[PDB]
Paper text:
[name], the most abundant karyopherin in budding yeast, functions as a primary transporter for the H3:H4/Asf1 complex, whereas Kap121 acts as a secondary transporter. Here, we report crystal structures of full-length [name] (Kl) [name] alone and in complex with NLS peptides of H3 and H4.
The crystal structure of full length Kl [name] was determined using the single-wavelength anomalous diffraction (SAD) method and refined at 2.35 Å resolution with a crystallographic R value of 20.99% and a free R value of 23.49%. Crystals contain two copies of full-length Kl [name] per asymmetric unit. The refined structure displays 24 tandem HEAT repeats with a right-handed superhelical solenoid structure. The first HEAT repeat (residues 1–39), an intra-loop of repeat 8 (residues 325–329), repeat 15 (residues 631–656) and repeat 18 (residues 818–828) are disordered in the final structure. The unique extra-long helix of repeat 23 is conserved in budding yeasts, such as Saccharomyces cerevisiae and [name], and establishes an intra-molecular interaction with repeats 12–14 using electrostatic and hydrogen bond interactions. This interaction may further stabilize the superhelical architecture of Kl [name]. However, the dynamic behavior of [name] is thought to be restricted owing to intramolecular interactions between repeats 12 and 14 and the extended helix of the repeat 23. This extended helix restricts the distance in-between two lysine-binding pockets.
Residue numbers in the entry: 40 to 70, 76 to 113, 120 to 324, 331 to 630, 657 to 817, 829 to 1113
The structure:
């Protein structure tokens, strides 16, 4: 059997035969013989004498595999590693290394001998290879030392002492041009990141700094530079606390920006339609720093350098800064949005550059801004659209043409419904002309997406184009079933046409879609059975929209579709099959939409769907969050099918159940899965996602989501987790200025309490007791954003409790301190909302606070008034300014309604009227309308002289209300994000009271109201 492969190893004239004999011979070792001494001593002899190194190593590896199953071996190798003869040392170390590579358990008995050996051989003056092998061995030694129950303090100290030597080996390998061993040493430093700190000592920041010096050194070979960039990226994922402690964020960012500024192959960039350059890895480093660190450490340095780089004579620096921003936004979208006053002009400057690489860089930046800040970018369509079209018309490179189309796509998709209509017809004609001219399927795919995005924005305004578009696009979805002979891009073009035709079905509704429903639906049911994961994905996306369009009429298709979806969700995902991951995401969304659009006919599928999804939560690689989200979607469907109307639940702790036993059982199922995926959960994205789902369901259906029958086990578990997140002590945080991801975790943790306060009302006070001091403390954070979240959350909690809140005076006095002393205008703005509410709910004497609070509210008004003077150029400030006007006026109206005779009206009413109508936060109209009803009913002198301004304000309000009603009827199905916020009236009752008021006012002032066209329409 095997011992012949050893004979071949020693003896062939062909060295490549001895080598591959050994490569196979190792494989054989596991699967007896009296004389096994012959094969050891033969191998040891060959390992140290063969002429070529590859044949030496081959014998060495066989010795080791033998080594697992000889008390003299390790002692003899430790002796050989200290031989006077450098080649004998090297081959012994290699064999020791191969032994460590077998993970034999008894190697743990030699930690000290290995530490003492390697402290020596790491600096072997005669063989760089021996130093590199010593570094490589140390990885196994550190792992061995961390298997002790308590890490030996002496091992850690010795091992830490070796770290500077490894750095020397690295410099040695770079100096000597030995890039094979440079790579291996970088693997060693990467392994240091994972180590317990007592093994690595204080070093890690210094390893980062040393890696940065290599990365920016253009004299170093590029592949070594990528290793270095990659190491720092890896340190962001595993050791960000050390990066923060050294405050290296800005140095990392600036180093990466310099590498990305190096020139690149321009013609490749402009034509290649497809990660290992220094320039590309540098962008990935920026991208990861933006996700990992607070924006002061990454985005702020970038925006500081935007002026000088964007004007540089070096086009690669103009290109570099735009691409830097393009990769900043995903990790720091809020900070990026706040810098739009600088960033948008910069993208416009970039589009006007003479160099195409800079123009492409600007386009990539815009695509990235649209993806993350959707409608916020589309507001600038008036500058962008002319520029982007001109680039499409005059493009000389395919990659510019693609990204121009894709930028146009992202803008058009989120254009305001009113504005798209001015563009819709000229746009429609241009995109179909483009579609004809271009024959590349990569380019056609991007044009089809832009067309569908027109439909999405236009809603019912798309009807004139619906039949021509489908006629045309039906050409790209022939022979769906036949995938043999199609390129990946041909598949994408087919898939995108299915997706965007179904999006047109969302724009025009079921009646206008009636012509094509059957052929298109049949075509999509072909897609689902096909062997393209991309094509199946587009089938499910098509079905998801059909569910929105046809509601319960789509139920006859359930028997057919669900079996396909279950099959899609159960597929093996492995070398992670990205196409299957996308398909599963969309199939889960299809299942959710079908469940919410079938109602009673999705009752046979509820239990099987929960079992399939629960299996994915437990076992899937990237579908956990979505699988769990879909489970709550199934619950939402079951609760709606039981005619629990959204927001109509009984408040307070439920002593039993307001839901029938079948529904409660479905709820409890998902409630258990939710809490098991937050308890001890290490991924913050998973925690964020669970908290978001729980808040949403609590908001819609009440406390029955978290508790029933007086048993608060899960409620207390939830609050425990949330409280821990607020304190920074949850498993997902314990692997300052916070990253935005970290800020989201805070926001959604606070929002659990917000939702519970509205669920519980008075009942919440006992739950709130533990979190209340922490939230009051977060209101004082050195971080402005944390203060903004906390003050905002306390105010919503106050709204949740209302007049059943036992802490009004404590909370009132805390928000008054924020209102009075906080340096941030936006924090003071958020506080003024909470202050008015607490006064509205208070039942004790507040006469002592009215005068100081009014003074502070007026100062806040004055700082916002000054900012309002220079903001034709900065919408982030304009939103804060406008929200301050709404909140302060709302709070003042609340104060007057609560205690009119403590507020001197003579100056307050005019200050109120000067900030009406509002531009945002229309919910604050509610106290103001009630105030106007009271002042006019008492014929108050102050408002009576102000009747023109008051009827003028309602003229704006009612015009806005009519636009809102029209926008709602025209819009594309399923765009109900902003529904509550666009409303001018919080209730039909307050709306009708206002109409009667305008009726009276028309009886006085000799028909002042009728004179106005808008109100004449409402008054009659």
């Amino acid at each position: 059997a095997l011992p012949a492969l050893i004979h071949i190893l020693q003896n062939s004239s062909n060295d490549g035969i001895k080598q591959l004999a050994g490569v196979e011979a190792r494989k054989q070792v596991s699967k007896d013989a009296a004389t096994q001494t012959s094969v050891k001593q033969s191998l040891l002899n060959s390992a140290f004498n063969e002429g070529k190194d590859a044949v030496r190593h081959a014998n060495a590896r066989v010795i080791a595999s033998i080594g697992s199953e000889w008390p003299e071996l390790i002692p003899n190798l430790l002796q050989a590693a200290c031989d006077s003869n450098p080649k004998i040392r090297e081959t012994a170390i290699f064999i020791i290394l191969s032994l460590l590579e077998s993970f034999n358990a008894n190697l743990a008995l030699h930690i000290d001998d290995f530490l003492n050996l390697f402290a020596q051989t790491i600096n072997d003056s005669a063989s760089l290879e021996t130093r590199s092998l010593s570094a490589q061995a140390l990885s196994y030694v550190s792992s061995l030392i961390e298997e002790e129950g308590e890490i030996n303090p002496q091992y850690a100290a010795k091992f830490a002492s070796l770290i500077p030597s490894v750095v020397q080996v690295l410099d040695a390998t770079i100096r000597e041009g030995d890039t094979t061993n440079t790579k291996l040493i970088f693997n060693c430093l990467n392994d240091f990141l994972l180590l317990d700190s007592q093994l690595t000592g204080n070093t890690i920041a210094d390893l980062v700094k040393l890696a940065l010096q290599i990365a920016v050194n253009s004299d170093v070979d590029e592949d070594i530079r990528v290793f270095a960039v990659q190491f720092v990226t890896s340190a962001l994922v595993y050791r960000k606390s050390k990066i923060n402690q050294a405050k290296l964020g800005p140095e990392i960012t600036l180093a990466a920006l310099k590498v990305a500024s190096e020139e690149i192959d321009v013609e490749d960039e402009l034509t290649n339609e497809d990660e290992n350059t220094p320039a590309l890895t540098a962008l990935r480093l920026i991208s990861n720093a933006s996700g990992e660190l607070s924006p002061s450490q990454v985005g702020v340095p970038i925006i500081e350098h935007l002026p000088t780089m964007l004007s540089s004579s070096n086009p690669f620096e103009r290109r570099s800064i735009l691409l830097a921003i393009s990769v900043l936004v995903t990790g720091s979208p809020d900070y990026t949005l706040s810098q739009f006053d600088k960033i948008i002009p910069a993208t416009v400057t970039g589009l006007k550059d003479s160099e195409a690489v800079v123009q492409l860089a600007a386009l990539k930046c815009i695509v990235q801004l649209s993806t993350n800040l959707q409608d916020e970018v589309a507001r600038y369509h008036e500058q962008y659209l002319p520029l982007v079209i001109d680039i499409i018309d005059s493009a000389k490179h395919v990659v510019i043409y693609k990204y121009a189309t894709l930028a146009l796509d992202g803008l058009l998709e989120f254009i305001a419904h009113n504005d798209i209509i001015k563009y819709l017809d000229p746009l429609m004609n241009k995109l179909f002309q483009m579609l004809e001219t271009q024959q590349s399927p990569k380019l056609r795919a991007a044009i089809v997406s832009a067309i569908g995005s027109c439909a999405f924005a236009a809603g019912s305004g798309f009807v004139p184009y619906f039949k021509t578009s489908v006629q045309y696009l039906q050409q790209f979805i022939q022979n769906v079933s036949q995938i043999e002979g199609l390129s990946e891009d041909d598949i994408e073009l087919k898939a995108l046409t299915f997706e965007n035709i179904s999006t047109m079905g969302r724009a025009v509704k079921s009646a206008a879609f009636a012509e094509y429903a059957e052929p298109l639906v049949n075509a999509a049911y072909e897609a689902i059975k096909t062997d393209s994961a991309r094509l199946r994905e587009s089938g499910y996306a098509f079905i998801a929209n059909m569910a929105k369009v046809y509601g319960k009429d789509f139920a006859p298709f359930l028997q057919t579709i669900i079996p396909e979806i279950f099959k899609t969700l159960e597929q093996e995902e492995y070398t992670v099959n990205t196409g299957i991951a996308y398909e599963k995401e969309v199939a889960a969304a299809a299942l959710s939409e079908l469940a919410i659009a079938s109602k009673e006919h999705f009752l046979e599928y509820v239990e099987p769907s929960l079992k399939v999804l629960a299996e994915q939560v437990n076992e899937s690689y990237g579908l956990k969050e979505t699988a769990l989200h879909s489970m709550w979607a199934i619950v939402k469907a079951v609760l709606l099918t039981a005619n629990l109307k959204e927001g109509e639940y009984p408040k307070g702790v439920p002593s039993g159940s307001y839901v029938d036993a079948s529904a409660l059982a479905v709820i409890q199922t998902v409630r258990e899965v939710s809490l098991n995926n937050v308890i001890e959960e290490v991924e913050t994205s998973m925690v964020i996602s669970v908290f978001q789902d729980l808040s949403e369901m609590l908001r819609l259906f009440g406390p029955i989501i978290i508790m029933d029958n007086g048993d608060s086990t899960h409620l207390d578990q939830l609050c425990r987790e949330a409280l821990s997140v607020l304190k920074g002590e949850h498993a997902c945080q314990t692997i300052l200025d916070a990253s935005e991801t970290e800020a989201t975790l805070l926001d959604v943790a606070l929002d659990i309490y917000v939702a519970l306060s509205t669920n519980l009302v008075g009942g919440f006070a006992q739950v709130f007791t533990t979190a209340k001091p922490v939230i009051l403390q977060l209101c004082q954070s050195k971080s402005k954003n944390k203060r903004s979240f906390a003050v905002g959350a306390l105010s919503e909690i106050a709204l949740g409790m209302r007049d059943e809140n036992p802490f009004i005076q404590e909370l009132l006095e805390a928000l008054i301190i924020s209102l009075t002393n906080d340096k941030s205008l936006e924090v003071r703005c958020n506080a003024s909302y909470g202050v008015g509410l607490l006064i509205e709910y208070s039942s004790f004497d507040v006469s002592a606070i009215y005068s100081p609070v009014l003074k502070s509210l007026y100062e806040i008004l004055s700082v916002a008034d000054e900012k309002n003077l220079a903001t034709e150029d900065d919408e982030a400030t304009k939103e804060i300014v406008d929200r301050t006007f709404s909140n302060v006026c709302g709070c003042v109206a609340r104060m007057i309604l609560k205690h009119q005779n403590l507020v001197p009206l003579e100056h307050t009413i005019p200050a109120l009227l000067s900030h009406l109508p509002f531009n945002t936060a229309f919910e604050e109209y509610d106290p103001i309308f009630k105030l106007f009803l009271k002042l006019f009913q008492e014929q108050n002198s102050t408002i009576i002289n102000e009747a023109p301004k008051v009827i003028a304000i309602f003229a704006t309000v009612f015009e806005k209300e009519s636009e809102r009603i029209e926008l709602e009827t025209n819009s594309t199905l399923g765009r109900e994000e902003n529904l509550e916020k666009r409303k001018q009236f919080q209730s039909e009752e307050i709306k009708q009271q206002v109409i009667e008021l305008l009726k009276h006012l028309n009886q006085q002032f000799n028909g002042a109201v009728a004179q106005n066209p808008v109100l004449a329409q409402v008054i009659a």
